[PDB]
Amino acid sequence: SIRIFPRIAGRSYIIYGQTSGIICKRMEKSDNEFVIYNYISEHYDKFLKKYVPKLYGKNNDMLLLEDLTYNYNNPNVMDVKIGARKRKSHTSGFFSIRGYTNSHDYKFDPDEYLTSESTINHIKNFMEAGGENRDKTKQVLLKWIMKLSELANDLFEINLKFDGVSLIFIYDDDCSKCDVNVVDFSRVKLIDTNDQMTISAVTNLIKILSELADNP
Ligand SMILES: O=P(O)(O)O[C@@H]1[C@@H](OP(=O)(O)O)[C@H](OP(=O)(O)O)[C@@H](O)[C@@H](OP(=O)(O)O)[C@H]1OP(=O)(O)O
Ligand SMILES: Nc1ncnc2c1ncn2[C@@H]1O[C@H](COP(=O)(O)OP(=O)(O)O)[C@@H](O)[C@H]1O
Ligand SMILES: [Mg+2]
Structure with missing residues (x-):
């Protein structure tokens, strides 16, 4: 059933x-x-x-x-809340990681407020399933940066308050395929300007993913 x-x-x-x-x-x-x-x-x-x-x-x-996970042999999924939380502030200042595939193995806790160092480490933990091939994980990050930078651009012209929306990052274990999409419109509202808080969330993730892609 x-x-x-x-x-x-x-x-x-x-x-x-x-x-x-x-x-x-x-x-x-x-x-x-x-x-x-x-x-x-x-x-x-x-x-x-x-x-x-x-x-x-x-x-x-x-x-x-x-199903964003359907075309994947071995999907790894990370949910990052980029819209305003209901009452709380963001666990990483501009966004909150809500979970990821294997997070229990790294003692990830969604109630825990994080430093920049711990935020970056949790994203690194999420990328571990992608294996030792630096070049292939770097291509995953660059394709995420490509779509997030276009999303941040496009959000300047959209008059919605994206309260509670998440980004769903997905990559295959073999790093042959990845994507990121916006989900969860249950608390989104009409407004007469753009959502600078949600834009700041995306530009901050772009900044973090860029340092990871450029790491020597
Ligand atoms: O802090 P948030 O806004 O990230 O968390 C919400 C929480 O959202 P989520 O964890 O289910 O995505 C649930 O709200 P819904 O998205 O389901 O409406 C929780 O129920 C909500 O608590 P509350 O509904 O009892 O106020 C969390 O909000 P809060 O912890 O900011 O109060
Ligand atoms: N279209 C989708 N395809 C695949 N997984 C999804 C999809 N939408 C939601 N999910 C999964 O469901 C979880 C919760 O989705 P979300 O829409 O944020 O629901 P909620 O309102 O309960 O927070 C996400 O963290 C993700 O793992
Ligand atoms: Mg949600």
Whole structure:
């Protein structure tokens, strides 16, 4: 019957679709996530196509979403919250890592406030599954930098407050494939300017990933 999806973070009920390449995410409190997918579809379709998993449909309170992990033999996933948290400040100042594949092995704790040193170490821990080939992990980082730098650019022209949105970083163990996408629109709001807090989150990650890519 029901196969639970292996979430990295969050609190939402998420299951595999009965069909390949789909995940079903329950909207717990309101349909606001659906309203925001549809708004972005009508007002910023290009943003939706570049950065956001496909919404294929709705079944009562379930969103049918593209499984970002589907085309991977051995996916490693990191969830980084880049939008404002509800009440708390960010564990790494401009963003909060919420989890990653194998994080329990490094005693990662999502409640722990981190220094720059510990933040960088947790991202390094996440890259460990990618093996010893410096050149291949560096190509993963550069492709993430490529898409995040375009996202930061595009966000200047989008009049949404991306409260609670996450970045889902994915790379294959063999480092042949990687991506990053924006998920979780449940608390996103209309506003009459751009979201400088969320832009600062992305530019700060671009800065951290760039030092990792340039490390000797
Ligand atoms: O601090 P946040 O905003 O990163 O964390 C929220 C938390 O989000 P998440 O960890 O499920 O993504 C849950 O909120 P929802 O995203 O589910 O609405 C927690 O329930 C929420 O606590 P609360 O809903 O009981 O206020 C966390 O917020 P808070 O710790 O800032 O209060
Ligand atoms: N489209 C997706 N494809 C693959 N994994 C996803 C997708 N959306 C969410 N996830 C997984 O589910 C987790 C929680 O997703 P999110 O939308 O942030 O839900 P919540 O509202 O519970 O925080 C993420 O950390 C990630 O592991
Ligand atoms: Mg979330």
